[PDB]
């Protein structure tokens, strides 16, 4: 029937109360799962939220139980990390002809970029040619834009890979897809397997291969799952690898920018750093060198989240500035600045928030006086500015910019990383009466730039900014239980996520939910057969331009009414959030 080709794979809605026993829940990829710790997130206060997300992030480091999924600390995963470090060594010994590519869509692509830079520095600080590069769905501009649409083409991913792999003789392709989902990566991995003599693909993500995405890619014949299963078979001969620890669901369902991007770093910085630091020691990377790093990264979570109350406050003051209708600025130096930008930009698609709502800034790259003259004029009593720096940074360039902002603002707070026994110039740096001093132990680094110190600092910031940004929006009431209902369908995964949220919250059949969704998307046109049968990219291209598509669809379902009637009902409610919330009653 028209549509069946497209919607066949979708699991039926279960009857009330049989969501577990239908086997439905056991088939939701871990990355899409609702996290039980966050079922009441929409009611938690700011301090709760910080605790719950703190807890969620902790699950990255939790160990495997006694029938269950491999995790980060499991032997199979660490053993895989060792082998892979092994393969990076082969290339590090033979840079003439060698390349290492880190690739992903969205936040996986952001993380890819950061890491490509860091390990490029490391080899430069040693006067080796850099061997690392990145790829991001939608080319380099994607790094700092919201561009959720660009991950849906395998042919794209393969092209970007063909470019950068020039006439290199040995390429290592680390494809990052938290959900084992992005068609962009799928093409890259599949290409590599078709040319083993040059390419070595390493797939990274956080679902078991049996939960890997399995719907058809529009421009490609194989699914992510087949690709991944085939890589796993090649692992027995050491010509492909799959690194896929479970780290548990996101605190905000399907928000893989969070735990997923963090685990992406934890996992890859660990493994590559190991490979580097053990080559010039003339010694294979072992689990013991990796574990050192993982435990460091695990200390870092505890270090970070012990500043919880102060974190909870910054959230409260980001919430307020947006609750009024102010803006929030995230101002940071070197790499921490970048990560500030990345968090801000992600708030656009993740929350439907405007690019001014939470904006990042590096000294987007608007330098000292340029910030003084450009952005400074437009500050306001009710805004919030956030400063993010180490003590190694240049605190003159910092004190000046804060000195200025104090006048036009007063809601300033800061994020200062420091070795122990570094002191904060101006004992009246108050200015900041209640800093977020994150003071690090002294660790035993040997490479010139102290790269482990860097990775700690990045991760810790990411955790803070993510927890803050996400938290602030929850407090505003924009999140439903632990789901972002009112997302903008801008790729096929978000289309599927929308459909799943309609089944979840309404309890109504696969076919009704699909119908209401497609009606909501294409209104005022009605369901033709062409539309039913149309590929998911056609729905996406039309929905991406609309507002409240999902809430309208859900309302049509709950009231069993037309799109005309549910739109009218929406417009006559005080807000989207109350309309939906009380239709659920
Ligand atoms: C329809 C449907 C569905 C699934 C799978 N889609 S997906 O894009 O096809 C996908 C994405 C990743 C992956 N590994 N496999 C499949 C992504 C969204 N997804 C999903 C999301 C949430 C839920 S959920 N547990 O019902 C709740 F929304 F409440 F979390 C269930 C399924
Ligand atoms: O790494 P994945 O599963 O392939 O997802 C890639 C991107 O869709 C994803 O990073 C998304 O942009 C983020 O908003 C998730 O919160």
UniProtKB/Swiss-Prot annotation:
The lineage of its organism: Eukaryota, Metazoa, Chordata, Craniata, Vertebrata. Interacts (fructose 6-phosphate bound form) with GCK. Residues 88-284, 318-478 form the SIS domain. This is Glucokinase regulatory protein. Found in liver and pancreas. Not detected in muscle, brain, heart, thymus, intestine, uterus, adipose tissue, kidney, adrenal, lung or spleen. The gene is GCKR. One of its GO terms (cellular component) is mitochondrion. Keywords: Carbohydrate metabolism, Cytoplasm, Mitochondrion, Nucleus, Repeat. Its main location: cytoplasm. Fructose 1-phosphate and fructose 6-phosphate compete for the same binding site. PANTHER family: GLUCOKINASE REGULATORY PROTEIN (PTHR10088:SF4). Residues 442-444 are annotated as: Essential for interaction with GCK. It comes from the Eukaryota. Beta-D-fructose 1-phosphate binds at residues 107-108, 151, 177-179, 346, 493. Regulates glucokinase (GCK) by forming an inactive complex with this enzyme. Acts by promoting GCK recruitment to the nucleus, possibly to provide a reserve of GCK that can be quickly released in the cytoplasm after a meal. The affinity of GCKR for GCK is modulated by fructose metabolites: GCKR with bound fructose 6-phosphate has increased affinity for GCK, while GCKR with bound fructose 1-phosphate has strongly decreased affinity for GCK and does not inhibit GCK activity.
